[PDB]
Every structure is written in structure tokens, then in C-alpha cells.
């Protein structure tokens, strides 16, 4: 009962507001971290411990097979279904996701140490840089 | 290139409320995932795929050896500077936190499968429930 190795995810948090407020802390960082769940990865070697606490929102995940059209609900998102398809262009990963917005879909690829994605729905278009680690 | 595995970390993000605001998210969501870093894990073998995308806000870890005095600078957090001592009450994990807070420091035990952490400063109590993962 003394080891507490072990991934641990947060599922209730009371009074973390006021523990904030007694540490002074910038209102926006507290009400950021207010609905954020916490995971506290432990490792301890008898007496060593190496903790790292980590402060996030909502993790969005997705299995799929190039060329297999997929019914896709994409939650803790827009809570919408979609007929997702993903393709090979070239080395370039492209999806396009049929549903009740047009123009929606994704492309992924990578240039060297860097992955990029380009998110893609209407006429809006956000592109995103991810370096390696 | 095709393989694509690894974990990859966001350094840009641009027009993220526009993908946003054009797939109906509300508001208060743009307004808080649109300052988190992102990461995205791919396990790929061939053409099967198995991402994850996470979001993250901000990170805290401490090493620390049981009954041995450190210096714990709280950056990222209320960026102070704190005295810790961290030694065993019976199963309970106690550190007290010599600083300019009264009352600052945190107990953490392990009841059945869920560790209890309590952290406390001045005369706010925190109570916080993790479950296994």
C-alpha cells in the first residue's frame, strides 16, 4: 500500500478553485484549469519518486484501415456522424468525412522532422506544424 | 514520406477558431482549446492507423527523494520558491512545503484502487480521487 506506481486519472476534484485562490494565481490559468482533467503518472522505487502531473481536456481518437470507409462519430467534438473515407495522394494522407457539413476533411502529411495537418470544413481552413519527439 | 509512427508535438496552430466556429462548437469550448498545446500519437503498420490527439494545458513534475529536504521552485504554477520535505505518515505521503504560505503542502495515499491526494495552503482544502488506468 506504500507503492503508488501507476497511471492515475482524475475523477473528482473538489475545492481546487479555492486551493487556486489561497496560491494566488491568475484568474484565466484558474478558470482554464478549473474543468481540466488531471493525470498523475508515479514512479516510485522504494524512496525515489519520479511524478509528472499533466492538465488536459478532451483526448479525440480514431482507428482506421486506408481505403475502408468508416461510420465516424466524432465526439467530445461536434457530436455528429460522419462517412469517412482516407486515401493515399501521392504521400500525402487525405480524408474526407461525408456528413451534413461540406468541404469537411483533413490532409497529413510529413516534409522531413515535421508532420503537418491541414483541417479543412466550409470555407474555414486551419493547418497545423508537430515536430517529432 | 508514408510511415508516419511516433508522437508528434503541436508548435502551430492557425485559423483554429475558424475550424471551429464553423463546426458549431461552442463558444466557451474555442475559448479554452484554442490556447492548448496538442499532441498526436500514430501507431502505424502499413495502411492500419491508431492515433490519438490529445490537448494539454500545462505539465508539473517534481523528483524527489522520501525524508531528504529540496528546493521546489513552483514555476509555471505560482512560480515561488518552497522548503519540501516529503517523508511516510504510516501509508500516507506527506510533504510539507516550508514557504511563505502557512499551512502549504499535500498528503496522497492508496485505499483499495484509488490513490487520495489532499492538497492544502492557508485554509483551503483540496480533495481529489484518481482511479487506476
Same mark, same amino acid.
Given at each position: 500500500?506504500?507503492? =503508488? &506506481?501507476?497511471?492515475? *486519472?482524475?475523477?473528482? +476534484?473538489? +475545492?481546487? @478553485? !479555492?486551493?487556486?485562490?489561497?496560491?494566488?494565481?491568475?484568474?484565466?490559468?484558474?478558470?482554464?484549469? #478549473?474543468?481540466?482533467? =488531471?493525470? /498523475?503518472?508515479?514512479? %516510485?522505487?522504494?524512496?525515489?519518486?519520479?511524478?509528472?502531473?499533466?492538465?488536459?481536456?478532451? &483526448?479525440?481518437? #480514431?482507428?482506421?484501415?486506408?481505403? #475502408? *470507409?468508416?461510420? @465516424?462519430?466524432? /465526439?467530445?467534438?461536434? &457530436?455528429?456522424? $460522419? /462517412?469517412?473515407?482516407?486515401?493515399? *495522394?501521392?504521400?500525402?494522407? $487525405?480524408? $474526407?468525412?461525408? !456528413?451534413?457539413? @461540406?468541404?469537411? !476533411?483533413?490532409? =497529413?502529411?510529413?516534409?522531413?522532422?515535421?508532420?503537418?495537418?491541414?483541417?479543412?470544413?466550409?470555407? %474555414?481552413?486551419?493547418? =497545423? $506544424?508537430? /515536430?517529432?519527439?
Amino acid at each position: 500500500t506504500r507503492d =503508488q &506506481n501507476g497511471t492515475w *486519472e482524475m475523477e473528482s +476534484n473538489e +475545492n481546487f @478553485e !479555492g486551493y487556486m485562490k489561497a496560491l494566488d494565481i491568475d484568474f484565466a490559468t484558474r478558470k482554464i484549469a #478549473v474543468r481540466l482533467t =488531471q493525470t /498523475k503518472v508515479i514512479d %516510485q522505487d522504494g524512496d525515489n519518486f519520479k511524478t509528472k502531473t499533466t492538465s488536459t481536456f478532451r &483526448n479525440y481518437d #480514431v482507428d482506421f484501415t486506408v481505403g #475502408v *470507409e468508416f461510420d @465516424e462519430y466524432t /465526439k467530445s467534438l461536434d &457530436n455528429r456522424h $460522419v /462517412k469517412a473515407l482516407v486515401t493515399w *495522394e501521392g504521400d500525402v494522407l $487525405v480524408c $474526407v468525412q461525408k !456528413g451534413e457539413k @461540406e468541404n469537411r !476533411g483533413w490532409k =497529413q502529411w510529413i516534409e522531413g522532422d515535421k508532420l503537418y495537418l491541414e483541417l479543412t470544413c466550409g470555407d %474555414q481552413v486551419c493547418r =497545423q $506544424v508537430f /515536430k517529432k519527439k
